[PDB]
Amino acid sequence: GAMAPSYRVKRMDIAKNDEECVVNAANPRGLPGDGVCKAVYKKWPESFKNSATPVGTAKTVMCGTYPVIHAVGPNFSNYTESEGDRELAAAYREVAKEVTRLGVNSVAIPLLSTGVYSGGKDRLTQSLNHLFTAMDSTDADVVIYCRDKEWEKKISEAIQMRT
Ligand SMILES: C[C@H](C(=O)O)[C@@H](NC(=O)c1ncnc2[nH]ccc12)c1ccc(Br)cc1
Numbered sequence: 001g002a003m004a005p006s007y008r009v010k011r012m013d014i015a016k017n018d019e020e021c022v023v024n025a026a027n028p029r030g031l032p033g034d035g036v037c038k039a040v041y042k043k044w045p046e047s048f049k050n051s052a053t054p055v056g057t058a059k060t061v062m063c064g065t066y067p068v069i070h071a072v073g074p075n076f077s078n079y080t081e082s083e084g085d086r087e088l089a090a091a092y093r094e095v096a097k098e099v100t101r102l103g104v105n106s107v108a109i110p111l112l113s114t115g116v117y118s119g120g121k122d123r124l125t126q127s128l129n130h131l132f133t134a135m136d137s138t139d140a141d142v143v144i145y146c147r148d149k150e151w152e153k154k155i156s157e158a159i160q161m162r163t
Helices: 036-043 082-104 124-135 151-163
Strands: 007-011 022-024 058-063 066-071 106-108 140-144
Touching: 007 151, 022 036, 036 058, 036 082, 058 082, 066 124, 082 106, 124 140, 140 151
Parallel strands: 007 140, 022 066, 022 106, 106 140
Antiparallel strands: 058 066
16 A cells, blocks of 8 residues: 555546556446546557446456556436435445555546536536545545646645645
């Protein structure tokens, strides 16, 4: 594990992360997809072999020796608020289990179920809180990657508020 496990946020492409493994905001079918998923596909295409997995789960596939953890968050256009919230929390718990199993000292992670899976709602606080609930008991350094400029400031404030 990391010597002093921490949380950090960076506004940049997760495909260019400086961590020991990456979490993909995957679709359930293991398709190249769009946004984060497409960037992950362009960088580690070999990791998409048999990467299909149900909503609320995570499946790791190695690209060489670099682990890609395909985490499938719910699309809130399809799920109710209650059922979607439960699947989103579950997807993050499965990511924590995989990060622990892999023995990595750091992990790059995006905010699951935001953007096109958000059902047109701002889900920064909801997704980030579920990320903390799952990762708080792990000892990996967590680096959150985002694209929205207002989101970088909000995530940074949320991390600092807890320290
Ligand atoms: C809404 C969120 C953000 O702005 O942080 C967005 N992130 C991104 O697209 C994004 N964030 C980090 N590295 C990236 N590389 C290429 C894209 C990209 C995102 C949308 C939908 C889902 Br599901 C998950 C994440």
